[PDB]
Amino acid sequence: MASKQELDAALKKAKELASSAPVVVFSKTYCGYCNRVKQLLTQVGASYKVVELDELSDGSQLQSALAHWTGRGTVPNVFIGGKQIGGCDTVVEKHQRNELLPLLQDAAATAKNPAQL
């Protein structure tokens, strides 16, 4: 039998992780892009979980479930309100469009606005 139930369990934990905070940043321990996304969200004033898949106890299979789930599985990988937004380039582009910030506000993730967008 293939590892289907292990992949499904990692997928279930990926959904759990993706929903454990209003914003979640699947990442790795050293990448400049992971640092960039952390600083991007910090500067607007967001509140976000970080999930360093190089250090998470099952992080390799968790990233494999991420790839299965998203058809992408890159790092960093950003979710808001339990839905994927995209990777580093996606959040930087949506920040430049002033399009990420309204969605962070809608999630009330920006602590500046607890009343939502």
Angle between helices 32-44 and 88-96 (to 10 degrees): 30
Dist CA 93 CA 100 (whole Å): 8
Show the tokens assigned to 41.
Answer: 């969200």
CA distance 28 to 34: 7
Annotation: binding site for glutathione: 28, 75, 88-89
Experimental method, per PDB record: NMR
Contact 51, 65 (CB under 8 A): no
CATH number at residue 117: 3.40.30.10
The per-residue DSSP string of 42-99 comes to HHHT---EEEETTTSTTHHHHHHHHHHHHS---SSEEEETTEEEEEHHHHHHHHHTT-
Would you list which residues are annotated within the binding site for [2Fe-2S] cluster?
Answer: 31
Task: For residue 99, give its domain range.
Answer: 1-117
Q: Which residues are annotated as a binding site?
A: 28, 31, 75, 88-89
Q: With contact defined as beta carbons under 8 Å apart, do 79 and 23 qualify?
A: yes
Q: Residue 86, SS3?
A: strand
Please count the structural domains in the chain: 1
